RNA sequence: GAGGCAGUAACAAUAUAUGUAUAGAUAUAGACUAGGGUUUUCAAUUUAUUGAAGUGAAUCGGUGUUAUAUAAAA
RNA sequence: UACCCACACAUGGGAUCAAUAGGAUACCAUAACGAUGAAGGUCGUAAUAGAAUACGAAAGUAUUUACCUAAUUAAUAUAUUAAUGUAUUGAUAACCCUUUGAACUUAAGCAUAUCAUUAAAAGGAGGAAAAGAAACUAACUAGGAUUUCU
């Protein structure tokens, strides 16, 4: 039950969709859905599927430091890129459930346009590991909430 | 190990009845709507000293 | 080597139950409990100050004690038949 | 359910020939909790029924040695029908034994009894 | 050696019921042997005495069990043929 | 103070141990009802506590006026639910209302299971209390 | 209770257009005792969770004798 | 695009304030164990039962009381004629009566001294125990068993 920071000015024509607590890392799914703001909804799904199949890099920005150099960052002006399997399955995931609820309040699905996207961080699950020497140290995983809404164009 | 006492076999059974979780029936009840066992043990985690 | 790997030589059980406590504390070959050291008739002065609490008066059943109090505060209900017997006695 | 009155009107002979037929009565009442189904108060009726029935039987028993032992000593008796109070007070003497005295005593003070006076 | 005493053992306290496992039911028939569920205390030569009282047909041998969860169960071979199916029948098993 | 004490105090949180932890007949006397003055003029006494099918009528609370028949006794929780009356839930306002028997009055009685020898026997022990006095 | 260093050190990653098969690759294997105690078998739901079933002795071990005032599962 | 600042909205965590079937201290009453089997332990009993809690084959709400346990078909002694009867044995964690008995510490070091007729340890009883009717105190114009307070 997280509350969107979003502003609704119009209740008809806006499309939320949420998942709580999702078991993949936070840093990867922060540096993917960077770039998906103003966008077709159409344009993303066809983007994403390149990411899997190794055809289109995702630009890293904020949490980049040790990334190889490649040239099909030049798209974005950029000089690093990765390729993420698991965080993008689980933003496909997202964009499918969008798409069904247009077609069951019968709206037009090229009209509409990707408007707020964000994520945040989540309580910790603990683990555990044994070192050299008798020592033992934490490994534990972060997850995250992913949250987006989708708007109709003018 | 296949060769056991008399002792040894009574106290082993009392041991196992008393791993397991809260029955379903009693579980639907307004006291135990939530409530589950905290008590329960693994075989491979923690022994039993028995001997 | 002293540590790791003499550690796999340790499968030999010495301590057993005791009849009169029931603790894990019973020597197989010096034939003495631990903790109560049981063959002898008078039980063994605990430890510390700690032990004396573990096991005392009153932290069992009191099978008989509960009835011994409460006789002392509200009279003991009497059977008909066995009290007109005593009157009998000589 | 059965009353606990019913068992004090029978005899000693028919009391034991209810014990049977009632302890048969749980044995077609196990066997059904395995291949069909019981009623959710069944069984517990007839357990009681035989604790009710039982301590009839060692109260009957009890007044035949009421009977035999009537008038004795009390070293005579059997020790579970003596009287019991505590182990300190058994051997504690009576009040009669602990009040008799010395004849110099007791025949003095029967001389001179006591008096009953007024203010100073 | 008591004053008032306990009654006598009855054979309605030995036995409780009779197992409808899907092995007992295969030593009814091919074997023609009764599985029962006796009381833990009592050995071999009383409960083969108990079941030639309560059933009336005559038992030769009891191979006696105890299993992991605290029972003990007795395999009584039956002399004559067709009595335990007759047995169980009657019992309602 | 273990469980259903019944002491004489002044603190707080002794009085209120033996609330929650009583049994037997201190539980009963707890939940009693006010006469009405009909009946007051026949038996004699104040009060006298609450059995099952009695006629009962509301003296006070959002519920005032209304007079019904008692459903259910629940000594756990010393509620009572009287006829007539609706309280609103998740799905509908179907569910009876749940009271507090010291809000409520009652009418007419109800016969059952030697109830009228419990209230010749009070009106008996009342009258020698007054003989005594005079 | 939660940071930086940092998604950094350190570990895991066999082939087939149709497959309950055709191939490749690494590791000797199986029984009694000491220790473990339901991990056994099956069903349903995804090295997990719940529920049933399963250990049958006149001749296989203990219970017997002793090691110069408590000793043997070889 | 990254780095910095300002404002608005959402995550993370359990501080502040309010409550309370819990504790702490002082006073008053009681001061009831055990061979007629104690205190404590092991295993079992619920119509559908795991923890907790109550209870013994009469077993999850006025009698019964499974098996060990001083645990006893005994041991140390007395009485009657090898057998029978009687008395003792175990539990305590405060107060009471005996036995045995330290050191740390203080002396600005330390060895007599002090801590100390103490702590630990052992034996023996009761609701209280021990003491108690001058082979005394005094030097006065003489007092009067024991115990406790100033
Ligand atoms: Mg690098
Ligand atoms: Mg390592
Ligand atoms: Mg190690
Ligand atoms: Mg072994
Ligand atoms: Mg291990
Ligand atoms: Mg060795
Ligand atoms: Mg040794
Ligand atoms: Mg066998
Ligand atoms: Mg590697
Ligand atoms: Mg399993
Ligand atoms: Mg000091
Ligand atoms: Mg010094
Ligand atoms: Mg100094
Ligand atoms: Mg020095
Ligand atoms: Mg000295
Ligand atoms: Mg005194
Ligand atoms: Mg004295
Ligand atoms: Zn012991």
Same mark, same amino acid.
């Given at each position: 039950?997280?509350? =969107? ?70 798209? =974005? ?61 934490? =490994? ?15 | ?17 008393? #791993? ?16 589950? #066992? ?14 | ?90 | ?18 014990? @049977? ?17 019981? *009623?959710?108060? *069944? @069984?517990?009726? $007839?357990?009681?029924? @035989?604790?009710? $029935? ?22 005579? @008796? ?9 182990? $300190? *007070? ?18 003095? *003070? ?7 006076? $007024?203010?100073? | ?32 042997? &009764?599985? &029962? ?27 006696? &069990? ?11 071979? &039956? ?15 | ?42 038996? %004699? ?15 006070? %609370? ?73």
């Amino acid at each position: 039950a997280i509350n =969107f920071a979003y502003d609704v000015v119009d209740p008809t024509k806006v499309i939320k969709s949420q998942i709580d607590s999702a078991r993949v890392s936070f840093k990867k799914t922060r540096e993917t859905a960077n770039t998906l703001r103003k966008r077709s909804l159409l344009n993303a799904i066809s983007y994403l599927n390149n990411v899997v199949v190794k055809k289109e890099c995702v630009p890293m920005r904020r949490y980049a430091r040790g990334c190889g150099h490649t040239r099909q960052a030049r798209a =974005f002006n950029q000089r690093k890129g990765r390729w993420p399997k698991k965080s993008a399955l689980a933003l496909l995931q997202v964009l499918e459930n969008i798409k069904e609820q247009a077609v069951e309040k019968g709206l037009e699905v090229e009209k509409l346009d990707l408007d707020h996207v964000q994520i945040c961080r989540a309580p910790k699950v603990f683990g555990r590991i044994f070192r050299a020497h008798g020592r033992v140290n934490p =490994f534990n995983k972060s997850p995250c909430h992913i949250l987006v809404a989708a708007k109709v164009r003018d | 190990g296949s060769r056991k006492t008399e002792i040894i076999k009574t106290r082993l059974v009392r041991a196992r009845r008393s #791993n397991r979780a809260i029955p379903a029936w009693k579980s639907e009840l307004p006291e135990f709507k939530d409530k589950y #066992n905290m008590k329960r043990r693994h075989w491979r985690a923690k022994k039993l000293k028995i001997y | 080597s002293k540590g790791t790997a003499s550690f796999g030589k340790k499968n030999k059980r010495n301590h057993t139950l005791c009849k009169r406590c029931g603790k894990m504390s019973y020597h197989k070959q010096l034939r003495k409990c631990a903790s109560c050291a049981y063959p002898q008739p008078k039980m063994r002065t605990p430890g510390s100050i700690k032990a004396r609490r573990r096991n005392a008066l009153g932290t069992g059943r009191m099978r008989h004690l509960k009835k011994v109090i409460h006789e002392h505060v509200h009279g003991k209900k009497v059977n008909p038949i066995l009290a007109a017997f005593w009157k009998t006695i000589k | 359910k059965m009353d606990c009155q019913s068992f004090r009107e029978k005899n000693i002979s028919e009391l034991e020939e209810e014990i @049977i037929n009632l302890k048969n009565d749980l044995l077609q009442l196990r066997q059904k909790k395995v291949s069909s189904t019981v *009623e959710p108060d *069944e @069984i517990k009726t $007839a357990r009681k029924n @035989i604790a009710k $029935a039982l301590r009839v039987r060692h109260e009957k028993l009890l007044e035949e040695q009421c009977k035999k032992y009537e008038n004795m000593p009390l070293n005579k @008796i059997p020790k579970e029908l003596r009287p019991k109070k505590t182990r $300190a *007070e058994r051997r504690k003497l009576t009040k009669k034994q602990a009040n008799r005295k010395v004849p110099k005593v007791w025949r003095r *003070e029967l001389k001179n009894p006591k008096i009953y006076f $007024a203010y100073t | 050696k008591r004053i008032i005493p306990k009654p006598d053992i009855v054979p309605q306290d030995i036995i409780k019921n009779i197992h409808t496992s899907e092995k007992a039911m295969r030593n009814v028939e091919m074997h023609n042997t &009764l599985v &029962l569920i006796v009381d833990k205390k009592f050995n071999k030569r009383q409960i083969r005495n108990a079941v030639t009282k309560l059933y009336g047909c005559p038992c030769i041998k009891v191979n006696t &069990l105890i299993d992991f969860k605290g029972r003990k169960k007795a395999y009584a071979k &039956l002399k004559n043929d067709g009595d335990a199916i007759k047995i169980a029948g009657q019992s309602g098993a | 103070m273990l469980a259903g004490r019944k002491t004489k105090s002044s603190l707080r949180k002794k009085q209120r141990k033996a609330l929650f932890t009583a049994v037997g007949k201190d539980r009963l006397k707890r939940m009693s009802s006010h006469l009405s003055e009909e009946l007051r003029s026949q038996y %004699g006494f104040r009060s006298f506590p609450v059995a099952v099918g009695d006629i009962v009528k509301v003296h006070s %609370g959002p519920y005032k006026g209304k007079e019904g028949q008692i459903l259910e006794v629940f000594l756990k929780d010393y509620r009572i639910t009287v006829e007539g009356c609706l309280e609103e839930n998740e799905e509908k306002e179907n569910v009876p209302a749940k009271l507090h028997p010291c809000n409520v009055t009652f009418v007419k009685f109800n016969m059952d299971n030697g109830r009228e020898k419990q209230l010749e026997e009070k009106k008996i022990a009342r009258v020698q209390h007054i003989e005594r006095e005079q």
